[PDB]
């Protein structure tokens, strides 16, 4: 889940089309860390480029895989209503690369609760993901309800 605030007054970049190398070719860049079956960390870089009013193309690319294809086609397109409510395109299936034999991470990334107004700057409100790396017992505790919880 990736929740952002988008600024309506950002000018459309002149350096069309989208290029990963070109920093000015995208309005916003964010990063979300996902994990595969073997626990490898993939830093999904996502790029936000305003196409027209209330229409934002979102591109995705993993920096972990050097053999991954360069993003040249829209990963998703957020369409927004008049008052900053989401309309369509807020959820997209995303597949990572194959690193060290780990299967590509296929996960549904959702832009729900995203709201677009006249923010003073580009900020990402929240990034959540349900994957993690392998962990080992560092502590254990008993809560007031009797739950035994190992941290």
């Amino acid at each position: 889940s990736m929740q952002i605030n988008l600024n309506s007054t950002d000018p459309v970049p002149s350096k069309t089309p989208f290029s990963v190398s070109d920093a000015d070719s995208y309005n916003k860049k964010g990063t979300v860390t996902v994990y595969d079956s073997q626990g490898n960390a993939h830093d999904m870089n996502v790029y936000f480029v305003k196409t027209k009013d209330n229409e934002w193309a979102v591109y995705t690319h993993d920096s972990s895989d050097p053999a991954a294809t360069a993003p040249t086609t829209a990963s998703t397109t957020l369409k927004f209503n008049e008052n900053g409510i989401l309309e369509s395109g807020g959820t997209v299936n995303i597949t990572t690369g194959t690193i060290n034999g780990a299967t590509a991470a296929t996960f549904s990334l959702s832009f729900l609760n995203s709201m677009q107004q006249n923010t003073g700057a580009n900020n990402i409100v929240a990034t959540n993901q349900n994957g993690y790396k392998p962990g080992d017992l560092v502590s254990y505790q008993i809560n007031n309800d009797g739950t035994v919880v190992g941290n």
Binding site: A23, T31, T33, D43, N122, I124
Partner: protein, 51 residues
């Protein structure tokens, strides 16, 4: 600055923050927080493209 010239506290506590990425490197607020590194390596030259 520590042995690798990174920003550290008394204990060796490494400072982290938003790094500079791209060519030329730029501040990316959306990038993951990374340790701040200050190498002493000399800067190369960039050919003039716009004047």
């Amino acid at each position: 600055l520590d042995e690798n010239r990174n920003l550290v506290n008394m204990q060796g506590m490494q400072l982290t923050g938003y790094p500079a990425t791209g060519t030329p490197p730029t501040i990316q607020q959306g990038a993951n927080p990374a340790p701040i590194t200050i190498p002493n390596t000399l800067m190369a030259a960039k050919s003039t493209t716009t004047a």
